[PDB]
Design a protein around this ligand. Structure first.
Ligand code: XG4
Ligand code: MN
Length: 579
DNA sequence: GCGATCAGC
DNA sequence: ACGCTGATCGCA
């Protein structure tokens, strides 16, 4: 129903200097995944290419790598990483429909060409789920069905570039796509393909000690409970805690008693068993998610793990990391922090380098709110986390422990993002009247922040959306909702995403400037991970001293704000040691 | 599959 | 009744 050439070989007209390209990878995790077919649409027509002959054709391979041959794609990082696993480099991607739809509206959840095409009333293409199926019935169709689907997806990309670029221009997002998101897409592909070396023997050893330590706490729980039960079962746990031991019921779920960590901690004065349960869950958390889960996805031949950074998922412009999630590796507890010791450099005599912003969101907030006191505080390079901990616990700076500072961290972010006196009272275990007075004192010291949070909520009502400094956008229709609860959640989003999203923009530009700087200096250093406000690199030890002056300055100079940006940096033999 | 729960930023 | 996530697992 759409004409296309089911090609046997590669011809010259398939190698035009502009084309829409589809390199289809159906596997969810595209690392070392098969490429099932290729489609090319250009000024000379539409073509389908079997990959086993196109990826062996030297003319087609050189065309993929020629950055002067411009390609329009959807989810180009997926194709670039899958081609890297084939030994092939993809260059010249000038338009990515996935990232263009993500900037226009992150709430659409665009996951295939059809979903993005529907935004511009283009429907001459079927959803991937309709072609490949779901679950156990998911399979690659036969060639005449697969070929048309890929050709129709390429033809859609061919027709949709101009309408998407036009709306991006109106939204002041054209530079956000071409100079930020798309260059970052190539960087993340290099990071994902590089992987991170893992000391599997160190993990496997911890897994044996965790299993023997779990049983010790397990029997102490059975002894404290008086009987044996399924500690992971909410039904039996609720019966042991709130029926047999008759502990107070502080919170309910839709299904029964709540046993979250905040509940168990308030029950600590009532029985010893709740703290053993907390320690029991924490050991099981490390065992299930970070010992077993990490060893399951590690590449045995290289001892490397290859995460996937989802660039078009979060509503604020952050990244996310899946299978494995390398953005939530434990650190706050010392027994769980040891897992970062298993993340090691990929070569001998290389080291791990980690740099991170100091309170980037609060400094971003100070610049945007133009609050005199908050700006002055960061011009003094004050640690607002420590200062707030001093005011809360009524101590001096030398008396503030890292545990108190982490609590003040939630107070600083909580207050600026709309926490209530009720919520602050429950987080600090203080009276609700003390919380309201403390929030009152917090806003009289920073009246520009309170002014900004009121103005940004009102601007979201008038425009219907909020923006970040680099013009990333998030629509908030619920901010005019007739329901109080629904509207209140939307109001806190209006307070948060311009600040969290602007911090995501800044580090995204920092990664782009860093790689150009590294290439300029002809260094072997390269990025490994991004953890929201942290950059983790590996490099030969001979490059560490150059990086101590290069990486912080690049990150601090990504943008220029009314307050400076401060970057902390450490290096060591493991990720654990890089702090 | 969903939701409670928990690891991170 | 601060925000943004992903993985695990019992199933009330
Ligand atoms: N709304 C909210 N955002 C948070 C929270 N925690 C972290 N974020 C988000 C906000 C920011 O985007 C980032 C800050 O996380 P860190 O690096 O752990 N703390 P910082 O860098 O300020 O101080 P230092 O590094 O010296 O310890 O993660 C929170 O409790 N609430
Ligand atoms: Mn930080």
């Amino acid at each position: 129903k759409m004409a296309f050439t089911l090609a046997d070989r590669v011809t010259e007209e398939m190698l035009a200097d502009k084309a829409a390209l589809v390199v289809e990878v159906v596997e969810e995790n595209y690392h070392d995944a098969p490429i099932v077919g290729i489609a090319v649409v250009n000024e000379h027509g539409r073509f389908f290419l079997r990959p086993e002959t196109a990826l062996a054709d030297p003319q087609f391979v050189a065309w993929l790598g020629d950055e002067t041959k411009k390609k329009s794609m959807f989810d180009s990082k997926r194709a670039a990483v899958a081609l890297k696993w084939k030994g092939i480099e993809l260059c010249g991607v000038s338009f990515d429909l996935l990232l263009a739809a993500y900037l226009l509206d992150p709430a659409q959840g665009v996951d295939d060409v059809a979903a993005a095409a529907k935004m511009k009333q283009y429907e001459a293409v079927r959803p991937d789920e309709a072609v490949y199926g779901k679950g156990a019935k998911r399979a690659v169709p036969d060639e005449p069905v697969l070929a048309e689907h890929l050709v129709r997806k390429a033809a859609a990309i061919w027709e949709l570039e101009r309408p998407f670029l036009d709306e991006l221009r109106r939204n002041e997002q054209d530079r956000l796509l071409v100079e930020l998101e798309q260059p970052l897409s190539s960087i993340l592909a290099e990071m994902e393909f590089a992987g991170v070396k893992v000391d599997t023997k160190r993990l496997e050893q911890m897994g044996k000690e965790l299993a023997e330590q779990l049983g010790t706490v397990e029997q102490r729980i059975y002894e404290l409970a008086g009987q044996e039960f399924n500690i992971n079962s909410p039904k039996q746990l609720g019966v042991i805690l709130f029926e047999k031991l008759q502990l107070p019921v502080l919170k309910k779920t839709k299904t029964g008693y709540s046993t979250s960590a905040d509940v168990l901690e308030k029950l600590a004065p009532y029985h010893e068993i709740v703290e053993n349960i907390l320690h029991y869950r924490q050991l099981g958390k490390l065992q299930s998610t970070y010992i077993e889960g990490l060893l399951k996805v590690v590449r045995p031949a290289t001892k490397k793990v290859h995460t996937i950074f989802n660039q078009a998922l979060t509503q604020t412009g952050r990244l996310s990391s899946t299978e494995p999630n390398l953005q939530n590796i434990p650190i706050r507890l010392e027994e769980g922090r040891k897992i970062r010791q298993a993340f090691v450099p990929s070569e001998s005599d290389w080291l791990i380098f980690a740099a991170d912003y100091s309170q980037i969101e609060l400094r971003v907030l100070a610049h945007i709110a133009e609050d005199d006191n908050l700006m002055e505080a960061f011009r003094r390079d004050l640690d607002i986390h420590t200062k707030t901990a001093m005011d809360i616990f009524q101590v001096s700076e030398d008396e503030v422990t890292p545990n108190m500072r982490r609590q003040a961290k939630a107070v600083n972010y909580g207050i600026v993002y709309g926490i209530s006196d009720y919520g602050l009272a429950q987080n600090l275990n203080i009276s609700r009247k003390e919380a309201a007075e403390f929030i009152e004192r917090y806003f009289e010291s920073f009246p520009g922040v309170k002014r900004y949070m009121e103005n940004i909520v009102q601007e979201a009502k008038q425009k219907g959306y909020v923006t970040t400094l680099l013009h990333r956008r998030r629509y908030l229709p619920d901010i005019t909702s007739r329901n109080f609860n629904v509207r209140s959640f939307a109001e806190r989003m209006a307070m948060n995403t311009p600040i969290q999203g602007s911090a995501a923009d800044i580090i995204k530009k920092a990664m782009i400037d860093l790689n150009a700087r590294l290439k300029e200096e002809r260094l072997q250093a390269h990025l490994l991970l991004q953890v929201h406000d942290e950059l983790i690199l590996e490099a030969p030890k001979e490059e560490m001293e150059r990086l101590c002056r290069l990486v912080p300055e690049v990150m601090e100079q990504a943008v220029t704000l009314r307050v400076p940006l401060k970057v902390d940096y450490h290096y060591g033999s493991t990720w654990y040691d890089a702090k």
